[PDB]
Amino acid sequence: VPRPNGLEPQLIDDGNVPRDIAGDWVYPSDVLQVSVAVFRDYVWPMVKAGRTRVLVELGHYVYTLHYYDPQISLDEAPILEEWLSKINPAGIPPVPFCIPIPQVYPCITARRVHYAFTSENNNDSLFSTNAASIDTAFGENAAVSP
Amino acid sequence: VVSDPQSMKVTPIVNPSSYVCNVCNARFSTMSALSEHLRSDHR
Amino acid sequence: AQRQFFGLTYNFYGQPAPLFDLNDLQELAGCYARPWTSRFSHLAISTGSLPVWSARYPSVASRNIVVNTLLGAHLNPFAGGQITSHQGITWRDPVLSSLAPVPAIQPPPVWAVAENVLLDSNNYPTYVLNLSSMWPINQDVHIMTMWALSDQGPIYHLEVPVDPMPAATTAALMAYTGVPIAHLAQTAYRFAGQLPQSPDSTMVSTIRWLSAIWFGSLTGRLNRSRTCNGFYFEFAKPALNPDQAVLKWNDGARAAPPAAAQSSYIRCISPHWQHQIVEVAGALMSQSVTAVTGLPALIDEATLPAWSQGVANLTGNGQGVVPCLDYNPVPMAAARHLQWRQDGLITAAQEAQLNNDYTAYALTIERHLTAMLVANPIAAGRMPIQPFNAADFGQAGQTAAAVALAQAMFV
Numbered sequence: 001v002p003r004p005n006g007l008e009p010q011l012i013d014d015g016n017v018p019r020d021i022a023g024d025w026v027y028p029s030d031v032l033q034v035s036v037a038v039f040r041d042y043v044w045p046m047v048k049a050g051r052t053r054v055l056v057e058l059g060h061y062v063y064t065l066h067y068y069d070p071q072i073s074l075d076e077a078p079i080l081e082e083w084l085s086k087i088n089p090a091g092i093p094p095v096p097f098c099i100p101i102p103q104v105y106p107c108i109t110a111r112r113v114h115y116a117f118t119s120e121n122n123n124d125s126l127f128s129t130n131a132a133s134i135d136t137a138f139g140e141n142a143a144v145s146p
Numbered sequence: 147v148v149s150d151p152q153s154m155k156v157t158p159i160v161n162p163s164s165y166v167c168n169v170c171n172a173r174f175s176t177m178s179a180l181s182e183h184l185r186s187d188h189r
Numbered sequence: 190a191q192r193q194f195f196g197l198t199y200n201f202y203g204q205p206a207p208l209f210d211l212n213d214l215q216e217l218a219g220c221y222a223r224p225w226t227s228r229f230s231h232l233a234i235s236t237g238s239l240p241v242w243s244a245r246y247p248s249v250a251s252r253n254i255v256v257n258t259l260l261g262a263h264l265n266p267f268a269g270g271q272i273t274s275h276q277g278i279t280w281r282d283p284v285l286s287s288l289a290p291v292p293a294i295q296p297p298p299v300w301a302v303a304e305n306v307l308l309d310s311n312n313y314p315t316y317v318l319n320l321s322s323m324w325p326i327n328q329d330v331h332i333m334t335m336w337a338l339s340d341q342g343p344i345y346h347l348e349v350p351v352d353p354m355p356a357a358t359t360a361a362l363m364a365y366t367g368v369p370i371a372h373l374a375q376t377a378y379r380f381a382g383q384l385p386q387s388p389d390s391t392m393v394s395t396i397r398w399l400s401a402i403w404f405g406s407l408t409g410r411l412n413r414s415r416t417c418n419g420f421y422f423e424f425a426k427p428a429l430n431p432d433q434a435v436l437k438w439n440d441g442a443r444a445a446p447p448a449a450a451q452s453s454y455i456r457c458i459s460p461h462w463q464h465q466i467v468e469v470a471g472a473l474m475s476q477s478v479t480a481v482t483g484l485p486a487l488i489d490e491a492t493l494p495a496w497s498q499g500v501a502n503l504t505g506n507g508q509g510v511v512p513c514l515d516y517n518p519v520p521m522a523a524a525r526h527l528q529w530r531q532d533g534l535i536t537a538a539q540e541a542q543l544n545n546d547y548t549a550y551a552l553t554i555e556r557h558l559t560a561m562l563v564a565n566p567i568a569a570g571r572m573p574i575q576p577f578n579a580a581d582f583g584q585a586g587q588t589a590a591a592v593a594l595a596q597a598m599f600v
Contacts (some may be wrong), residue, residue, distance in 0.1 A: 001236040001237060001239070002168060002234070003234070004232065004233040005218040005219040005231065006219075008243060017239065019243075019244070023244070048157065048159045049159050071151065071152070072152065073153050073155045075155040075157050077156075077157035078157060110153060110154065113157075
């Protein structure tokens with residue numbers, strides 16, 4: 001619900017009592033499907049500003065990875081904004097998570113801005129972090145689990 | 147300005163691409179066109 | 190027109206400085222930091238029935254309760270003559286518009302923090318010499334006065350003459366028909382707060398006739414079968430948004446002008462007024478009248494808070510005072526439903542039904558405020574809730590006398 005003369009647009013909370021976007025929200029996935037058009041226009045501009053951590057609560061999703069290079073700078077916002085623009089009241093695209101490619105040496109890294117990160121430990125197929133490398137240095141070493 | 151590798155790139159906090167009617171929602175390409183919805187339809 | 194408003198600054202409740210910080214100045218709706226012509230600003234655009242309240246402002250009367258201490262904290266004029274400045278904040282110029290940070294080169298004197306400073310108005314000669322520009326400030330200060338002279342709900346003022354509604358009043362009122370009480374408060378206030386009107390203006394005697402005509406409805410005396418002069422307020426189910434009032438027009442059996450004037454100040458002791466947009470509207474809708482026309486008399490010192498005891502020209506104790514009949518939302522509406530059953534509007538079964546549906550609603554009002562006062566104490570800094578204490582919420586004072594006033598106000 002929008003508010004007059006410069007007042008925050010209240011986001012109708014669960015109990016059915018419009019609350020304000022600058023806070024911590026829990027988005028029952030289904031909701032996020034018949035609502036993105038809104039999400040992206042009021043809560044999204046908010047999350048980027050770094051003032052409204054939101055938990056999209058979806059049971060078990062498919063998950064696309066995207067390894068970028070920690071050397072160079074990157075801002076994970078568009079590989080997310082796009083994912084949002086592909087959510088119909090019908091179906092959502094496999095949640096995409098950006099992940100730095102694990103380096104061998106101790107490289108200087110560019111401050112990247114990330115947003116998507118799962119709560120449950122869904123890193124169960126990593127297998128190995130730097131097969132050939134004599135030792136991973138910046139990436140997350142993941143010695144072949146015995 | 148010195149183009150370089152690392153330099154914490156940060157997306158615009160409000161997508162400059164489209165412009166939503168705040169009263170209604172009929173979006174617009176250029177900010178300009180959105181002034182017309184708010185000056186015409188909503189006035 | 191009129192220029193001589195005697196005010197009174199908000200109480201501190203035992204706190205050091207006035208209950209509000211720096212952020213309150215740049216958060217007010219409408220015109221930047223201009224506290225004048227604010228109040229009903231966050232309600233300018235209606236989206237739905239749900240009462241507008243955010244995180245910092247946990248209630249309906251929260252927006253106003255804050256603009257009050259923020260108002261008094263910057264009211265050296267009328268009470269000193271100077272302009273001063275509180276925490277590096279002052280008015281732009283003599284007209285007194287928005288509040289900007291203290292100007293360099295020639296900064297004003299620091300305001301001496303004080304509790305309950307009597308406002309004389311004439312003490313600031315620039316006011317009368319520039320009335321048509323800084324007129325809203327008169328209406329607003331008057332509001333703060335009515336809110337300050339009470340620790341439990343704004344004390345407005347009902348009246349009603351001995352004779353029937355004027356011929357110019359009945360023609361002016363037939364324009365606010367399908368308009369909720371929430372909106373009548375917005376149109377009333379926005380009226381008397383933008384241009385110097387006269388005490389005997391057509392829109393003034395009609396808005397006053399609209400306020401006292403609302404009290405009878407709130408008490409149930411002026412229902413669907415008993416109009417004051419063809420105007421009343423139909424109330425919906427309490428479980429289905431009781432805030433809806435609306436001034437419906439009918440042609441039933443009108444009442445009758447009383448034998449004498451029923452001038453009487455009213456108050457809402459129960460802290461329920463805080464979250465009820467209907468109570469805050471009824472209060473501010475009446476205050477709009479006592480603005481253009483200063484207090485018809487003095488207020489009774491009978492009860493009231495411990496700080497409003499014997500004010501300069503506001504609260505007296507002699508014979509020139511008018512008694513203040515304070516009520517309580519729950520028992521008032523419980524007696525309001527009882528009136529409907531007496532004349533046959535509702536069945537004897539809907540009598541004890543509407544009571545349970547309303548007492549459950551008023552419970553939500555209580556469960557909300559108690560949970561907000563604990564979240565936002567008082568020693569923290571601000572006062573968006575106003576420390577009411579949980580020992581009350583249901584100690585109904587002379588509400589039974591306010592009801593007897595409505596029966597006498599419309600015989």
